[PDB]
């Protein structure tokens, strides 16, 4: 049931609602909307997509000094290790971007150009 909702609005006041979901499995999935249809992506993908970073930078980003949350230590290990399970071949951020472009190229209408 738990989840976060942030309504990001661009300077021009056009809005875009972004949701985070906690799966029972520890997995977190991100909801968004494109061509007013909804689309779900694993959050660790959008993280590795934003900036080149280490796994330790994301881990440190979330729990940080909070080293005592066995609850969070284990859920977050499920998250990162689980991503390592699904995508052993996304070794760098650029490749990840290639995976996103490849999977949305049909709908972002950028093709024969981008």
């Amino acid at each position: 049931h738990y989840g976060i909702q942030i309504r990001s609005v661009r300077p021009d006041q056009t809005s875009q609602t972004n949701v985070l979901h906690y799966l029972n499995d520890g997995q977190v999935t991100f909801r968004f909307s494109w061509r007013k249809n909804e689309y779900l992506v694993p959050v660790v993908m959008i993280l590795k997509a934003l900036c080149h970073t280490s796994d330790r930078e994301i881990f440190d980003g979330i729990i940080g000094n909070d080293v005592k949350d066995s609850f969070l230590t284990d859920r977050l290990e499920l998250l990162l290790r689980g991503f390592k399970k699904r995508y052993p071949h996304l070794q760098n951020r650029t490749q990840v971007l290639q995976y996103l472009g490849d999977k949305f190229r049909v709908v972002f209408q950028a093709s024969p150009d981008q």
Binding site: V41, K103, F104, R105, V106, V107
Partner: peptide
């Protein structure tokens, strides 16, 4: 392209 679209769909929703 539709097939590719399908792939996009695969990522979005089970």
């Amino acid at each position: 392209r539709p097939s590719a679209l399908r792939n996009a769909l695969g990522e979005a929703f089970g």
